[PDB]
Chain length 263, copies 3
C-alpha cells in the first residue's frame, strides 16, 4: 500500500500492490511496478522506471531516466521472477541501470547503502555492490560482479563478468578490469594492473599507521616477493594474526575465481 | 492507422498517420511520429521516442528512454527526409539511439532482425546492422558503419566511421576499431588488432570442422603468410572453390574501404 | 513569465517563475524549474529536465532525456544555489547531462554558443565550454574542466578534472586526457599524448599559411626543442610579437595547472 504521508505525482503510474513508505516522493512520469517496495523517505525525481521484484530502502535519491529492477541483458534470461535489493541513502543518478538477477546466477542483484552511482553507471544481473562505493560516469559492471565496501570505480571503466573488486579499491578511469582486484589496491589501465595500496583512502577512512603498513606488506607478499599465491596465502594469514585488517585478503582469496590482476 | 488489437497507452502520443500493427503495445509516455510504422506485436515499454520516416518490424521490444529514427548527428545533415529500417524480434534496451540516414550517405540507417542492442548502444546515420548481432553497453557505431551477421561488439567499444565489422566477428570490450575487421575474426585493443578466428562462435553456430579449418587457413593467408592482400585474394578465392564459407572473405574484400585491422 | 508566442505542451510541467521566451517550444513531458530561463526560439523536444538556477539562450535544441542544470555529482556539494549558463544555437542531443557548479569551484557551469553536444556527453560542475565546440558520444568532462573555442573531443573520451582543452584542439576518440592540451594540438591515446598541430582544422577555419607555420613552430618549441616550458615561454611570446595567433599559447600557459600532455 501507499503510505498516507507519501506523495505520488498525479502523472506517475504506481501499480496496485506497490509498497510506498512514509514521506517517500514519486515524481512526475515515474512508473512503479506492482512488486516494488520503496522505503521511507526515498525520492524518485521524475521519469524513473522501477519494476520487477524490487526492494528499495530508505532515503534514496533516484534521478530521472534511471531504470531500476528492469529485465537483465543475460542471453539466457527468459523472464524468471528474479530480484533486486537496494539499501539506504543511495544516490542513483541520471540514466543508471540496475537489472534483476538470473536464476543461474542466484536470482539476486544487490546494492548496499550510502553508494553514489553516477550518470549511466550499469549494475548487471547478479551483481553485488556493497556500502559506501562510488561508480563514476559510464562505469559498467558485467554480470556476476562484486564490488566491495568503499571501492571506487573511475569513469568509463568496465569490469569483466564474475570479477571481484575488493574493499577500499580504487580503479582509475578509462580502465578495463579483466581479473579480480584484491582489497586496498589501486588499479588502472586496460587491461588493469595493480599500482600499489590505496594509502590516501585508508588514511581518510581511519586506518592506523600499523594497519596501512601491514596492508602494504601484504601487498608486497602478493606482488613483490615473487612467491606464488599459494605460498603467500599462509604468510598473509600469519600477518593477519596480528593485524586483523589483513584478513580482508584472506576472505577475498576465498571468493576470487578469475585470478588476481597482475603486471 | 492503429490496428484495433493494438494498445496505445492513454498517456502516449501517437500522431495521426502512424501505422501500428496488430497486438502492438505503445506504453506510457511514448511519442510516435506520423511517419512511423510499428509492426505486429512490437512493444514500446515506456518513455520511447520514435519519429522520422521509420519502419519497425514484428515482435521487437524497445525499452524506456530509447530514441529511434531521431535526427542524426552528422554535421552536414540539414533535415532531409532520410529513413530508418528495423526488422523483427530485436531487443533494443534502455537509452539506445538509432539515427536516420544522410542524403550523402545513401539516406538509410538499417538494422536487421534478432539483434540485441544493449544499454546506450549507438547506431549512427547510414549504418547497416545485420541479423543476430550483439552490441553491448555503450557500444558506439560512428556514421556509415556496417556490422555483419552474428558479429558481437563488446561493451564500451567504438567503431570508427565507414568501418566494416565482418560476419561472426567478436570485438572485445574496451576496444577502438579504426579499420575493417574480416569475417570470423576476434579483435580487441585500442586500436583493435586481430587475435585469430572466433572458433567458439563458429562451433556454436554449426560450422563444420572442415569449414573452421579452411577459415583458419584463410586467416593465416591474410595475417601469417606475409603476402600482400592482393597476392592472397586469389589464394582465398581458390580455397573458397572447395569451402564456400571462405567466400565471406571475398565478399568482404569487395566492400572494405579502410584496410584490414593488422598487428 | 511565459511569452504569449511560446508553446508549452499540455503534458509539460513549467513551474511558476520560469521564464520562457518568444517562439520557444517546451515539448511533451518536459520539466522546467521555477529558476530556469529559456531564451527566444529554444526547443525542448520532449522528456527534458531543466532545473536549478539555469539560463539558456536563443535557438537551442535540447533533445529527449537530457538533464540540464541538475545537481552536480561533486562529493562535497550540499545543495547550495549554484548556476548553469548556456548560450545560443547549441544542439544538445539525447541524454546529455550538464550539472550546476559548486561553491568551491566558483558556482558556475558555463557553455557557450554554437556547440554540438552529442549523445550522453557530460559537462560536470564548474566546467567552462566555449563556442563552436564538439563533444562526441559519451565524451565526459570531469569537474572544473575548460574546453576552449572550436575544440573537438572524440567519442568515449574522458577529460580528467581541472584539465584545459585548448582552442582548436582535436582529441581523438577512445582517449583519456589527464593533463592540459595546448591550443591547436591533436591529442589521442590513454593517457593522451600530442600528435602535432590540427592543420586541417586551422585550414578550414581560415588560418593563413603564415599563422599555421608560426603555430607549428610554437609546437616545435614546446615539444621538439628539448627546452623546458619556462625557457620556451619567452620564445613563444617573442614569436607572437609577429604572429598574434601564437598568443593563444601564452594565454593558455597562464591558465594551465596540470602541466601539458607530453610523450
Ligand atoms: C579488458 O578489460 C575489460 C573490461 C570489461 C570487459 C567486459 O565487460 C566484456 N564483457 C562481459 O564480460 N560481458 C559483456 C557481454 C558482451 C557481449 C555478449 C555477452 C556479454 C557485457 C558487458 C557489459 C554489459 C553487458 C554485457 C562484455 O562485453 C572486457 C574487458
Ligand atoms: C582508435 O579507435 C577508434 C574508434 C572509434 C573512433 C571514432 O568513432 C572517431 N569518431 C568518428 O569516426 N566519428 C565521431 C566524430 C566526432 C567528432 C566530430 C565528428 C565525428 C563520432 C563518434 C561517435 C558518434 C558520433 C561521432 C568520432 O569521434 C576513433 C578511434
Ligand atoms: C588517464 O585518462 C583519464 C581521463 C579521465 C579521468 C577521470 O575523469 C578521473 N576522474 C575524475 O577526474 N573525476 C571522476 C571521479 C570518480 C570517482 C570519484 C571522484 C571523481 C569523475 C569522472 C567523470 C564524472 C564524474 C566524476 C573520475 O573518475 C581519469 C583518467
Amino acid at each position: 500500500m501507499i503510505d498516507k504521508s507519501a506523495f505520488v505525482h498525479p502523472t506517475a503510474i504506481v501499480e496496485e500492490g506497490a509498497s510506498i513508505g512514509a514521506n517517500a516522493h514519486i515524481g512526475p512520469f515515474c512508473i512503479v511496478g506492482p512488486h516494488v517496495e520503496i522505503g521511507e523517505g526515498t525520492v524518485l525525481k521524475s521519469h524513473v522506471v522501477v519494476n520487477g521484484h524490487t526492494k528499495i530502502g530508505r532515503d534514496n535519491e533516484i534521478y530521472q531516466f534511471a531504470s531500476i529492477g528492469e529485465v537483465n541483458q543475460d542471453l539466457k534470461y527468459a523472464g524468471e521472477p528474479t530480484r533486486v535489493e537496494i539499501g539506504d541513502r543511495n544516490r542513483i543518478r541520471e540514466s543508471v541501470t540496475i537489472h534483476r538477477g538470473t536464476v543461474q546466477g542466484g536470482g539476486l542483484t544487490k546494492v548496499g547503502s550510502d553508494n553514489l552511482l553516477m550518470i549511466n553507471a550499469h549494475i548487471a544481473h547478479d551483481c553485488t555492490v556493497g556500502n559506501r562505493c562510488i561508480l563514476a560516469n559510464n562505469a559498467t559492471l558485467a554480470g556476476h560482479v562484486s564490488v566491495d565496501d568503499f571501492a571506487i570505480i573511475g569513469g568509463m571503466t568496465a569490469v569483466h563478468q564474475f570479477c571481484i573488486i575488493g574493499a577500499h579499491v580504487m580503479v582509475g578511469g578509462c580502465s578495463g578490469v579483466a581479473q579480480d582486484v584484491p582489497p586496498y589496491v589501486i588499479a588502472q589501465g586496460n587491461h588493469a594492473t595493480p599500482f600499489g595500496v590505496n594509502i590516501e583512502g585508508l588514511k581518510r577512512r581511519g586506518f592506523s599507521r600499523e594497519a596501512i603498513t601491514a596492508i602494504r606488506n601484504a601487498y608486497k607478499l602478493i606482488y613483490r616477493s615473487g612467491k606464488t599465491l599459494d605460498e603467500v596465502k599462509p604468510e598473509i594469514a600469519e600477518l593477519a594474526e596480528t593485524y586483523p585488517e589483513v584478513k580482508a585478503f584472506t576472505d577475498f582469496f576465498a571468493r576470487s575465481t578469475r585470478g588476481l590482476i597482475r603486471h
